Amino acid sequence: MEFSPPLQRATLIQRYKRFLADVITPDGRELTLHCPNTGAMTGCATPGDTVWYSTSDNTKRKYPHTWELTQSQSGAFICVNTLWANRLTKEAILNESISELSGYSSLKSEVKYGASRIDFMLQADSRPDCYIEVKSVTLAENEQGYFPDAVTERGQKHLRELMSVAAEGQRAVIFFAVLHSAITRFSPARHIDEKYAQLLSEAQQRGVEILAYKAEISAEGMALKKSLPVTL
Ligand code: NA
């Protein structure tokens, strides 16, 4: 997808209170951005990093600018606004960048199915229903990507739900959208949430497919393109 209109740049002073960031624009003035990420944002919010923000045109809200990307001091692009993940995924399924998910005749979003909600469900006359859970990956240590970047009991629960989907003979996919341009491989963060990492291995055992695709990212746009090796 393309950022429309294109993003503007600034220099980070600090992210604070989770949802706010003070930045300095190219004119040397201060500006407060909405930070649409509630997580730790490890490696994504270093004072002095360049940030890229969008502008909401027709709103009277207090902070009509949103922090979209970080361009780290080592030159890497990071999409900190992980609220784009589902859209990038849908776009990549439909344009067939994600080959493992081609050959379905319909795509539905936000499907409530059980006594739980799935990000996408793919369907076809000849095939079992395909359930896709989308996860965002912004944690990098050099080239190694990790999820989660803090313990997640909610993540653990959804992972268990996917196992039930597979057990019932549906196709079940967990899809890690990799939003940091430095990442070249993916693993669960066993060192951070050991239980999640264990559940991820167990889900694989029980037939949940695990994919990780990397986004190409610039101030102009982002697109999921490249598949990445996963090591449990
Ligand atoms: Na999700």
PDB file of C-alpha atoms and ligand atoms in Angstrom:
ATOM      1  CA  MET A   1       0.000   0.000   0.000  1.00  0.00           C
ATOM      2  CA  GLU A   2       0.911   3.640  -0.515  1.00  0.00           C
ATOM      3  CA  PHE A   3       0.818   6.376   2.090  1.00  0.00           C
ATOM      4  CA  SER A   4      -1.562   8.938   0.660  1.00  0.00           C
ATOM      5  CA  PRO A   5      -0.535  11.741   0.926  1.00  0.00           C
ATOM      6  CA  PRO A   6       3.159  10.873   1.561  1.00  0.00           C
ATOM      7  CA  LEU A   7       4.451  10.954   5.131  1.00  0.00           C
ATOM      8  CA  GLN A   8       6.422  13.797   6.675  1.00  0.00           C
ATOM      9  CA  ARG A   9       9.541  13.549   8.821  1.00  0.00           C
ATOM     10  CA  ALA A  10      10.636  14.678  12.238  1.00  0.00           C
ATOM     11  CA  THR A  11      13.175  13.856  14.908  1.00  0.00           C
ATOM     12  CA  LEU A  12      12.078  12.029  18.045  1.00  0.00           C
ATOM     13  CA  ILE A  13      12.559  13.632  21.452  1.00  0.00           C
ATOM     14  CA  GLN A  14      10.623  11.070  23.538  1.00  0.00           C
ATOM     15  CA  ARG A  15       7.749   8.651  23.443  1.00  0.00           C
ATOM     16  CA  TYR A  16       5.911   8.999  26.772  1.00  0.00           C
ATOM     17  CA  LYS A  17       2.583   7.853  28.336  1.00  0.00           C
ATOM     18  CA  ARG A  18       2.489   5.110  25.674  1.00  0.00           C
ATOM     19  CA  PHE A  19       0.255   7.012  23.232  1.00  0.00           C
ATOM     20  CA  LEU A  20       2.256  10.262  22.853  1.00  0.00           C
ATOM     21  CA  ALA A  21       5.533  11.313  21.287  1.00  0.00           C
ATOM     22  CA  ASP A  22       7.198  14.722  21.160  1.00  0.00           C
ATOM     23  CA  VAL A  23       9.166  15.341  17.990  1.00  0.00           C
ATOM     24  CA  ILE A  24      11.056  18.203  16.314  1.00  0.00           C
ATOM     25  CA  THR A  25      10.006  19.026  12.740  1.00  0.00           C
ATOM     26  CA  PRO A  26      12.466  20.176  10.005  1.00  0.00           C
ATOM     27  CA  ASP A  27      11.657  23.825  10.978  1.00  0.00           C
ATOM     28  CA  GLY A  28      13.016  23.216  14.475  1.00  0.00           C
ATOM     29  CA  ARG A  29       9.587  23.411  16.130  1.00  0.00           C
ATOM     30  CA  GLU A  30       8.155  20.848  18.578  1.00  0.00           C
ATOM     31  CA  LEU A  31       5.150  18.689  17.639  1.00  0.00           C
ATOM     32  CA  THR A  32       3.196  16.042  19.540  1.00  0.00           C
ATOM     33  CA  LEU A  33       2.206  12.913  17.635  1.00  0.00           C
ATOM     34  CA  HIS A  34      -0.300  10.237  18.506  1.00  0.00           C
ATOM     35  CA  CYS A  35       1.648   6.992  19.039  1.00  0.00           C
ATOM     36  CA  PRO A  36      -0.627   4.176  17.871  1.00  0.00           C
ATOM     37  CA  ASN A  37       1.457   1.447  19.529  1.00  0.00           C
ATOM     38  CA  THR A  38       0.635   0.430  23.142  1.00  0.00           C
ATOM     39  CA  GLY A  39       3.583  -1.992  23.493  1.00  0.00           C
ATOM     40  CA  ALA A  40       7.195  -1.708  24.630  1.00  0.00           C
ATOM     41  CA  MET A  41       8.428  -0.587  21.173  1.00  0.00           C
ATOM     42  CA  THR A  42      11.893  -1.956  21.969  1.00  0.00           C
ATOM     43  CA  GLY A  43      14.389  -0.565  19.435  1.00  0.00           C
ATOM     44  CA  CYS A  44      11.622   1.561  17.839  1.00  0.00           C
ATOM     45  CA  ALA A  45      11.617   4.705  19.949  1.00  0.00           C
ATOM     46  CA  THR A  46      15.166   5.912  20.554  1.00  0.00           C
ATOM     47  CA  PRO A  47      15.517   9.689  21.150  1.00  0.00           C
ATOM     48  CA  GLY A  48      17.124  11.195  18.038  1.00  0.00           C
ATOM     49  CA  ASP A  49      15.643   8.628  15.619  1.00  0.00           C
ATOM     50  CA  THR A  50      13.869   9.986  12.566  1.00  0.00           C
ATOM     51  CA  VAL A  51      10.104   9.391  12.571  1.00  0.00           C
ATOM     52  CA  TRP A  52       7.565   9.569   9.732  1.00  0.00           C
ATOM     53  CA  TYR A  53       4.042  10.745  10.459  1.00  0.00           C
ATOM     54  CA  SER A  54       0.728  11.086   8.649  1.00  0.00           C
ATOM     55  CA  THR A  55      -1.784  13.959   8.960  1.00  0.00           C
ATOM     56  CA  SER A  56      -5.529  13.484   9.509  1.00  0.00           C
ATOM     57  CA  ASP A  57      -7.147  16.279   7.514  1.00  0.00           C
ATOM     58  CA  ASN A  58     -10.743  16.532   8.665  1.00  0.00           C
ATOM     59  CA  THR A  59     -10.693  16.130  12.428  1.00  0.00           C
ATOM     60  CA  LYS A  60     -10.878  18.414  15.443  1.00  0.00           C
ATOM     61  CA  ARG A  61      -9.081  15.872  17.674  1.00  0.00           C
ATOM     62  CA  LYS A  62      -6.159  17.118  19.774  1.00  0.00           C
ATOM     63  CA  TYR A  63      -3.370  15.283  17.919  1.00  0.00           C
ATOM     64  CA  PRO A  64      -4.227  14.976  14.232  1.00  0.00           C
ATOM     65  CA  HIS A  65      -0.755  13.551  13.435  1.00  0.00           C
ATOM     66  CA  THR A  66       0.087   9.861  13.748  1.00  0.00           C
ATOM     67  CA  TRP A  67       3.511   8.267  14.193  1.00  0.00           C
ATOM     68  CA  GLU A  68       3.698   5.674  11.370  1.00  0.00           C
ATOM     69  CA  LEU A  69       7.373   4.704  10.945  1.00  0.00           C
ATOM     70  CA  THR A  70      10.718   4.937  12.653  1.00  0.00           C
ATOM     71  CA  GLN A  71      13.901   5.200  10.641  1.00  0.00           C
ATOM     72  CA  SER A  72      16.522   4.029  13.162  1.00  0.00           C
ATOM     73  CA  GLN A  73      19.994   5.543  13.492  1.00  0.00           C
ATOM     74  CA  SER A  74      21.424   2.502  11.638  1.00  0.00           C
ATOM     75  CA  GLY A  75      19.144   3.286   8.677  1.00  0.00           C
ATOM     76  CA  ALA A  76      16.530   0.537   9.195  1.00  0.00           C
ATOM     77  CA  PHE A  77      12.840   1.296   8.577  1.00  0.00           C
ATOM     78  CA  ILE A  78      10.323   0.159  11.185  1.00  0.00           C
ATOM     79  CA  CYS A  79       6.541   0.352  10.841  1.00  0.00           C
ATOM     80  CA  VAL A  80       5.614   1.199  14.439  1.00  0.00           C
ATOM     81  CA  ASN A  81       1.955   1.591  13.593  1.00  0.00           C
ATOM     82  CA  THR A  82       1.137  -2.120  13.709  1.00  0.00           C
ATOM     83  CA  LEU A  83      -2.541  -1.328  13.115  1.00  0.00           C
ATOM     84  CA  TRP A  84      -1.572  -1.607   9.412  1.00  0.00           C
ATOM     85  CA  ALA A  85      -0.725  -5.334   9.685  1.00  0.00           C
ATOM     86  CA  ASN A  86      -4.139  -6.747   8.758  1.00  0.00           C
ATOM     87  CA  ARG A  87      -4.415  -4.461   5.706  1.00  0.00           C
ATOM     88  CA  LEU A  88      -0.921  -5.380   4.496  1.00  0.00           C
ATOM     89  CA  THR A  89      -1.764  -9.040   4.913  1.00  0.00           C
ATOM     90  CA  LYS A  90      -5.080  -8.809   3.052  1.00  0.00           C
ATOM     91  CA  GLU A  91      -3.451  -6.849   0.249  1.00  0.00           C
ATOM     92  CA  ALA A  92      -0.656  -9.473  -0.064  1.00  0.00           C
ATOM     93  CA  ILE A  93      -3.100 -12.388  -0.066  1.00  0.00           C
ATOM     94  CA  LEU A  94      -5.203 -10.799  -2.843  1.00  0.00           C
ATOM     95  CA  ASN A  95      -2.287  -9.761  -5.074  1.00  0.00           C
ATOM     96  CA  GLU A  96      -0.786 -13.243  -4.534  1.00  0.00           C
ATOM     97  CA  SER A  97       2.479 -12.133  -2.883  1.00  0.00           C
ATOM     98  CA  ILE A  98       1.737 -14.753  -0.207  1.00  0.00           C
ATOM     99  CA  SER A  99       1.845 -17.866  -2.376  1.00  0.00           C
ATOM    100  CA  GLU A 100       0.986 -20.210   0.507  1.00  0.00           C
ATOM    101  CA  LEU A 101      -2.429 -18.525   0.666  1.00  0.00           C
ATOM    102  CA  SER A 102      -3.369 -18.368  -3.050  1.00  0.00           C
ATOM    103  CA  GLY A 103      -6.195 -20.237  -4.751  1.00  0.00           C
ATOM    104  CA  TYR A 104      -9.142 -19.311  -2.556  1.00  0.00           C
ATOM    105  CA  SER A 105     -12.279 -17.719  -3.990  1.00  0.00           C
ATOM    106  CA  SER A 106     -13.294 -15.553  -1.010  1.00  0.00           C
ATOM    107  CA  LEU A 107     -11.662 -13.663   1.877  1.00  0.00           C
ATOM    108  CA  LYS A 108     -13.583 -12.592   4.992  1.00  0.00           C
ATOM    109  CA  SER A 109     -12.293 -10.343   7.831  1.00  0.00           C
ATOM    110  CA  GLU A 110     -12.940 -10.384  11.573  1.00  0.00           C
ATOM    111  CA  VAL A 111     -14.817 -13.669  11.592  1.00  0.00           C
ATOM    112  CA  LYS A 112     -16.447 -14.759  14.832  1.00  0.00           C
ATOM    113  CA  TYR A 113     -16.829 -18.524  14.579  1.00  0.00           C
ATOM    114  CA  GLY A 114     -16.893 -20.356  17.962  1.00  0.00           C
ATOM    115  CA  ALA A 115     -18.415 -20.139  21.443  1.00  0.00           C
ATOM    116  CA  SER A 116     -13.193 -16.405  19.425  1.00  0.00           C
ATOM    117  CA  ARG A 117     -12.516 -14.092  16.442  1.00  0.00           C
ATOM    118  CA  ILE A 118     -10.178 -14.742  13.501  1.00  0.00           C
ATOM    119  CA  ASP A 119      -8.391 -12.005  11.537  1.00  0.00           C
ATOM    120  CA  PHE A 120      -9.086 -13.638   8.149  1.00  0.00           C
ATOM    121  CA  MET A 121     -10.971 -16.640   6.847  1.00  0.00           C
ATOM    122  CA  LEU A 122     -10.321 -17.889   3.342  1.00  0.00           C
ATOM    123  CA  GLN A 123     -12.791 -20.150   1.542  1.00  0.00           C
ATOM    124  CA  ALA A 124     -13.052 -22.279  -1.611  1.00  0.00           C
ATOM    125  CA  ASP A 125     -15.401 -24.938  -2.952  1.00  0.00           C
ATOM    126  CA  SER A 126     -12.697 -27.634  -3.083  1.00  0.00           C
ATOM    127  CA  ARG A 127     -10.840 -26.782   0.151  1.00  0.00           C
ATOM    128  CA  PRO A 128     -11.193 -26.723   3.950  1.00  0.00           C
ATOM    129  CA  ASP A 129     -11.739 -23.253   5.449  1.00  0.00           C
ATOM    130  CA  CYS A 130      -8.492 -21.403   6.086  1.00  0.00           C
ATOM    131  CA  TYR A 131      -8.156 -19.482   9.385  1.00  0.00           C
ATOM    132  CA  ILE A 132      -5.402 -16.846   9.585  1.00  0.00           C
ATOM    133  CA  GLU A 133      -4.164 -15.080  12.708  1.00  0.00           C
ATOM    134  CA  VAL A 134      -2.004 -12.026  12.032  1.00  0.00           C
ATOM    135  CA  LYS A 135       0.793 -11.027  14.413  1.00  0.00           C
ATOM    136  CA  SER A 136       3.043  -7.949  14.112  1.00  0.00           C
ATOM    137  CA  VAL A 137       6.804  -8.213  14.539  1.00  0.00           C
ATOM    138  CA  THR A 138       8.839  -5.112  15.348  1.00  0.00           C
ATOM    139  CA  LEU A 139      11.404  -6.600  17.792  1.00  0.00           C
ATOM    140  CA  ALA A 140      14.811  -7.036  16.206  1.00  0.00           C
ATOM    141  CA  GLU A 141      18.191  -7.987  17.675  1.00  0.00           C
ATOM    142  CA  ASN A 142      20.418  -7.322  14.687  1.00  0.00           C
ATOM    143  CA  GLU A 143      18.869  -9.625  12.035  1.00  0.00           C
ATOM    144  CA  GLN A 144      16.967 -11.854  14.413  1.00  0.00           C
ATOM    145  CA  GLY A 145      13.258 -11.088  14.730  1.00  0.00           C
ATOM    146  CA  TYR A 146      11.227 -12.043  17.797  1.00  0.00           C
ATOM    147  CA  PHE A 147       7.676 -12.203  19.024  1.00  0.00           C
ATOM    148  CA  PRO A 148       6.417 -11.320  21.602  1.00  0.00           C
ATOM    149  CA  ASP A 149       8.398  -8.395  23.045  1.00  0.00           C
ATOM    150  CA  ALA A 150       6.713  -8.772  26.436  1.00  0.00           C
ATOM    151  CA  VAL A 151       4.745 -11.666  27.975  1.00  0.00           C
ATOM    152  CA  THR A 152       1.316 -12.105  26.359  1.00  0.00           C
ATOM    153  CA  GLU A 153      -1.424 -14.241  27.911  1.00  0.00           C
ATOM    154  CA  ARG A 154      -3.828 -13.007  25.222  1.00  0.00           C
ATOM    155  CA  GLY A 155      -1.389 -14.224  22.534  1.00  0.00           C
ATOM    156  CA  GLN A 156      -1.110 -17.583  24.303  1.00  0.00           C
ATOM    157  CA  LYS A 157      -4.909 -17.923  24.271  1.00  0.00           C
ATOM    158  CA  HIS A 158      -5.310 -17.179  20.526  1.00  0.00           C
ATOM    159  CA  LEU A 159      -2.522 -19.659  19.791  1.00  0.00           C
ATOM    160  CA  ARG A 160      -4.525 -22.305  21.717  1.00  0.00           C
ATOM    161  CA  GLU A 161      -7.647 -21.358  19.744  1.00  0.00           C
ATOM    162  CA  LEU A 162      -5.780 -21.988  16.464  1.00  0.00           C
ATOM    163  CA  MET A 163      -4.882 -25.477  17.697  1.00  0.00           C
ATOM    164  CA  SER A 164      -8.611 -26.244  18.086  1.00  0.00           C
ATOM    165  CA  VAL A 165      -9.262 -25.003  14.560  1.00  0.00           C
ATOM    166  CA  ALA A 166      -6.612 -27.428  13.205  1.00  0.00           C
ATOM    167  CA  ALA A 167      -7.912 -30.274  15.424  1.00  0.00           C
ATOM    168  CA  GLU A 168     -11.316 -29.782  13.741  1.00  0.00           C
ATOM    169  CA  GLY A 169      -9.772 -30.286  10.305  1.00  0.00           C
ATOM    170  CA  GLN A 170      -9.719 -26.661   9.173  1.00  0.00           C
ATOM    171  CA  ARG A 171      -6.507 -25.141   7.805  1.00  0.00           C
ATOM    172  CA  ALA A 172      -4.930 -22.977  10.531  1.00  0.00           C
ATOM    173  CA  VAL A 173      -2.211 -20.407   9.835  1.00  0.00           C
ATOM    174  CA  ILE A 174      -0.376 -18.021  12.142  1.00  0.00           C
ATOM    175  CA  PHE A 175       1.072 -15.234  10.072  1.00  0.00           C
ATOM    176  CA  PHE A 176       3.845 -13.031  11.414  1.00  0.00           C
ATOM    177  CA  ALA A 177       3.919  -9.718   9.577  1.00  0.00           C
ATOM    178  CA  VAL A 178       7.519  -8.593   9.934  1.00  0.00           C
ATOM    179  CA  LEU A 179       7.626  -4.798  10.107  1.00  0.00           C
ATOM    180  CA  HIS A 180      11.354  -4.134  10.699  1.00  0.00           C
ATOM    181  CA  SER A 181      13.608  -3.935   7.637  1.00  0.00           C
ATOM    182  CA  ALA A 182      16.597  -5.445   9.511  1.00  0.00           C
ATOM    183  CA  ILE A 183      14.937  -8.775  10.278  1.00  0.00           C
ATOM    184  CA  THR A 184      15.986 -11.698   8.033  1.00  0.00           C
ATOM    185  CA  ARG A 185      14.764 -14.620  10.168  1.00  0.00           C
ATOM    186  CA  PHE A 186      12.089 -15.266  12.746  1.00  0.00           C
ATOM    187  CA  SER A 187      11.770 -17.040  16.116  1.00  0.00           C
ATOM    188  CA  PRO A 188       9.445 -16.889  19.081  1.00  0.00           C
ATOM    189  CA  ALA A 189      11.004 -14.923  21.983  1.00  0.00           C
ATOM    190  CA  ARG A 190      11.551 -17.920  24.282  1.00  0.00           C
ATOM    191  CA  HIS A 191      13.701 -15.648  26.493  1.00  0.00           C
ATOM    192  CA  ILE A 192      10.783 -13.215  26.948  1.00  0.00           C
ATOM    193  CA  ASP A 193       7.652 -15.388  26.918  1.00  0.00           C
ATOM    194  CA  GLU A 194       8.806 -18.966  27.318  1.00  0.00           C
ATOM    195  CA  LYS A 195       5.244 -20.271  27.532  1.00  0.00           C
ATOM    196  CA  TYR A 196       4.330 -18.650  24.186  1.00  0.00           C
ATOM    197  CA  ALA A 197       7.409 -20.124  22.511  1.00  0.00           C
ATOM    198  CA  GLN A 198       6.466 -23.579  23.860  1.00  0.00           C
ATOM    199  CA  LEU A 199       2.886 -23.177  22.677  1.00  0.00           C
ATOM    200  CA  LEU A 200       4.124 -22.129  19.226  1.00  0.00           C
ATOM    201  CA  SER A 201       6.137 -25.390  18.899  1.00  0.00           C
ATOM    202  CA  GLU A 202       3.173 -27.406  20.159  1.00  0.00           C
ATOM    203  CA  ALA A 203       0.864 -25.688  17.654  1.00  0.00           C
ATOM    204  CA  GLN A 204       3.234 -26.672  14.858  1.00  0.00           C
ATOM    205  CA  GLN A 205       3.078 -30.267  16.200  1.00  0.00           C
ATOM    206  CA  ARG A 206      -0.679 -30.115  16.012  1.00  0.00           C
ATOM    207  CA  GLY A 207      -0.620 -28.860  12.410  1.00  0.00           C
ATOM    208  CA  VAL A 208      -0.817 -25.056  12.668  1.00  0.00           C
ATOM    209  CA  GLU A 209       1.185 -23.531   9.799  1.00  0.00           C
ATOM    210  CA  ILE A 210       3.590 -20.733  10.659  1.00  0.00           C
ATOM    211  CA  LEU A 211       4.541 -18.076   8.122  1.00  0.00           C
ATOM    212  CA  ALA A 212       6.592 -14.940   8.416  1.00  0.00           C
ATOM    213  CA  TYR A 213       6.671 -12.330   5.685  1.00  0.00           C
ATOM    214  CA  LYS A 214       8.784  -9.210   5.647  1.00  0.00           C
ATOM    215  CA  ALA A 215       7.451  -5.836   4.562  1.00  0.00           C
ATOM    216  CA  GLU A 216       9.320  -3.472   2.295  1.00  0.00           C
ATOM    217  CA  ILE A 217       8.984  -0.089   3.949  1.00  0.00           C
ATOM    218  CA  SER A 218       9.613   3.498   2.925  1.00  0.00           C
ATOM    219  CA  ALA A 219       8.063   6.932   3.526  1.00  0.00           C
ATOM    220  CA  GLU A 220       5.986   6.237   0.385  1.00  0.00           C
ATOM    221  CA  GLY A 221       4.511   2.841   1.182  1.00  0.00           C
ATOM    222  CA  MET A 222       4.824  -0.666   2.559  1.00  0.00           C
ATOM    223  CA  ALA A 223       4.165  -4.097   1.081  1.00  0.00           C
ATOM    224  CA  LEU A 224       4.593  -7.641   2.326  1.00  0.00           C
ATOM    225  CA  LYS A 225       6.934  -9.305  -0.211  1.00  0.00           C
ATOM    226  CA  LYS A 226       9.566 -11.686   1.077  1.00  0.00           C
ATOM    227  CA  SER A 227       9.037 -14.934   2.988  1.00  0.00           C
ATOM    228  CA  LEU A 228      11.400 -15.476   5.966  1.00  0.00           C
ATOM    229  CA  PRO A 229      12.846 -18.618   7.576  1.00  0.00           C
ATOM    230  CA  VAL A 230      11.193 -19.587  10.859  1.00  0.00           C
ATOM    231  CA  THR A 231      13.095 -21.429  13.632  1.00  0.00           C
ATOM    232  CA  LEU A 232      11.109 -22.591  16.631  1.00  0.00           C
TER     233      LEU A 232
HETATM  234 NA    NA B   1      -4.052 -10.382  15.383  1.00  0.00          NA
END
